[PDB]
Amino acid sequence: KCTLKSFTVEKGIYQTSNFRVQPTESIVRFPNITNLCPFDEVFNATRFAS
């Protein structure tokens, strides 16, 4: 009824909308890297260059 914007629908076949199975869960895959990047030695350096 909402698609036709009418309270009465004549006999027939109407295409209303679409369907799509929603995702079940979420996964994320990254390489087995554990070393943390040397942000400390670059940022926390006592003296910087010119």
């Binding site: 350096a45 006592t46 003296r47 910087f48 260059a49 010119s50």
Partner: protein
């Protein structure tokens, strides 16, 4: 972490020439640099700091050049009074460093 070498080991040139010393770094140290001279039986004295600026009371014959990795110390004219050992100091990062100063370079002037 920071290691340097100083070359040449020794130089010899008559009174009218120009003597030059190379101080090279494993990784770049920017301008941060200092050149030191010690007479025998005498503590070292600062000659060039920041690799470019002349020290106090030092004659205008010693020139420091280069930036980053390669640095050169050039003397326009010798007078047989600069015959001593010269060192270059990293003065950049000394967290875990065996020696802030580099190798020894003795200057020999034959007059």
């Amino acid at each position: 972490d920071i290691v340097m070498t100083q070359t040449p080991a020794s130089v010899s040139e008559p009174v009218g020439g120009t003597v030059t010393i190379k101080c090279q770094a494993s990784e770049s140290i920017s301008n941060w640099l200092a050149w030191y001279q010690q007479k025998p039986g005498q503590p070292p004295k600062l000659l060039i700091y920041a690799a470019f600026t002349l020290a106090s009371g030092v004659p205008s014959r010693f020139k420091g050049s280069g930036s980053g990795t390669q640095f050169t110390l050039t003397i326009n004219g010798v007078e047989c009074a600069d015959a001593a050992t010269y060192y270059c100091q990293q003065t950049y990062s000394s967290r875990d460093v065996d020696n802030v100063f580099g190798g020894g370079t003795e200057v020999v002037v034959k007059g």
